[PDB]
Amino acid sequence: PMTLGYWNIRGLAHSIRLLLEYTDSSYEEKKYTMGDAPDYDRSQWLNEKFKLGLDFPNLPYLIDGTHKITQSNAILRYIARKHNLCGESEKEQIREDILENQFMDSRMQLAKLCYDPDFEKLKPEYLQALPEMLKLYSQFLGKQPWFLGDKITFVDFIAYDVLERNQVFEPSCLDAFPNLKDFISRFEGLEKISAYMKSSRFLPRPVFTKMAVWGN
Amino acid sequence: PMTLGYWNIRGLAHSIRLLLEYTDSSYEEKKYTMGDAPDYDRSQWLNEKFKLGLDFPNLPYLIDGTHKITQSNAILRYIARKHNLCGESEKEQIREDILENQFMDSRMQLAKLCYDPDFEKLKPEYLQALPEMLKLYSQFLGKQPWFLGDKITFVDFIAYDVLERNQVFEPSCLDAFPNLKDFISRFEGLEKISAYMKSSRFLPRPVFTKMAVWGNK
Ligand SMILES: N[C@@H](CCC(=O)N[C@@H](CS[C@]1(SCCCCCCO)CC=C([N+](=O)[O-])c2nonc21)C(=O)NCC(=O)O)C(=O)O
Ligand SMILES: N[C@@H](CCC(=O)N[C@@H](CS)C(=O)NCC(=O)O)C(=O)O
């Protein structure tokens, strides 16, 4: 089987792990443990980092035969293409590309906050902006069952992760956006996803690394 | 014409303007000016931001007919598909994806440095790590003329922007990597590109916005 390498946390492997399960992929997981503070020892990853045949050694990584991939977006697009889970038409491709980068931007803004020493001082400034962030997403989904329309594709897995981790951060953040809330239930309702969240494989905790002020 | 909206700098628009030029695209530019410090008045952009019909108002943006795009990678990929400037085989697509994301990480790393008030003290750590970063790109390019092999694709335009601006940052950084500088020459030697670079539409400076410590100016 193929190998997914990540920290033993949720992080950037969440949507990947979900997609792998949705896709009925045969995979094992290489889980890396990071040291405590103050050092945050990374040595378990580091003995190994340049010895796996990765062009740009990074985490997450996926090995699949002669295919050795880093960058979370690339791993997603790789598994996605294998199972016809991408935007098919031109218009769908545009939305795919905009969403993948937007959600990445949203993901980073949350991490930026949760890793900064000034968490508490900067927290309210993020919560100010969050409704307006999600509003944009909600309008874009509209009445669609999925972000690219009638077809579920990979951006949905990125969407779920980003949306749901905001819900863990601010529990009522989606309440003002029914379509977003429905998207969570809909995605969590999918036969192979809810099977996997009912299993021992599943890992929603912790969100970030031991380095993070929030969710570590 | 298409409209490309961005700050009046290099920034995230470099690869885009170069790709528009290589592809003979008809385009017009809406350039926004940021105010001077300490406050960096953004009104020019901010009073127009939600009146352009964009799903996620942002800079850069492209208006092409009905098509309204933000996010620099989305814009690039949009122009690229029009002219068959994408990876074709699965291997090409994997490499294209890895690089687009990898280059963005490099890009942000330089940005994080140059926007930090502790620039001076932080500079040398970036310089120490730079050869390792450039080496990885050099090993990836190998004896290939472009990053996906035999033909140019949109990822070469990203590559060019990120590699070159590091040459602007440390002019000696590419010396140990002949393939990397040959890549730079080869790109700039492209007919439509040198013509563009000799024109007055060429905007190599300033690299970043007025908020930056390095390249602001
Ligand atoms: N990442 C997405 C969107 C990119 C994006 O964030 N957009 C910026 C213009 S990006 C800018 S200049 C600084 C921005 C000034 C305001 C703060 C930005 O929020 C350009 C280039 C950088 N570079 O080449 O390394 C750099 N590093 O840091 N800033 C930069 C912006 O002004 N947004 C309009 C708004 O917020 O209303 C993309 O790929 O398009
Ligand atoms: N932006 C990349 C990078 C992810 C990244 O920064 N990796 C972290 C974990 S989230 C890491 O531990 N990297 C390994 C390293 O630096 O050695 C991606 O999306 O996959």
Q: CB-hemisphere CA count at 13 Å for B119?
A: 12
Minimum CA distance residue for ligand 1 atom 15: B209
Ligand 1 proximity of B114 Cβ (cutoff 6 Å): no
Structure-block tokens of residue A201:
């494989």
For A78-111, the DSSP string reads HHHHHTT-S--SHHHHHHHHHHHHHHHHHHHHHH
> How was this one solved?
X-ray
DSSP A36: P
Buried b (16+ CB within 10 A) or exposed e, A104-121: bebbeebbebbeeeeeee
DSSP B2: E
Same domain? For A173 and A129 the reply is yes
Give the relative orientation of helices A90-115 and B72-82 as an angle to the nearest 10 degrees. 160
Same domain? For B103 and B61 the reply is no
Query: B71, A98: Cβ pair inside 8 Å?
Result: yes
Domain extent for B59 = 1-85+191-217
Query: A98, B140: Cβ pair inside 8 Å?
Result: no
Same domain? For B138 and B176 the reply is yes
Q: How far is A200 from chain B (nearest CA, A)?
A: 31
Q: How far is A199 from chain B (nearest CA, A)?
A: 31
Query: A140, B97: Cβ pair inside 8 Å?
Result: no
- Our count of domains for chain B comes to 2
d(CA B86, CA B97): 10
Quickly list H helices, A56-170: 72-82, 90-115, 119-141, 155-169
| Residues contacting B13, CB < 8 A, separation 6+ | B4, B6, B7, B60, B72
Q: CB-hemisphere CA count at 13 Å for A126?
A: 20
CA of B90 to the centre of ligand 1 (A): 31
Same domain? For B200 and B172 the reply is no
SS3 string, B118-142, reads: CHHHHHHHHHHHHHHHHHHHHHHHC
* CA B104 remoteness from chain centre: 9
We report the CATH number of the domain holding residue B179 as: 1.20.1050.10
Same domain? For A71 and A91 the reply is no
d(CA B203, CA B186): 20
Name every protein residue with a CB atom under 6 angstroms from any ligand 2 atom: A 11-12, 49, 58-60, 71-72; B 105
Same domain? For B100 and B71 the reply is no
- Three-state SS at B151: coil
Q: What angle do CA B210, B111, A52 make, to 5 degrees?
A: 175
Same domain? For A186 and A90 the reply is yes
Is B58 part of any known ligand binding site? Answer: yes
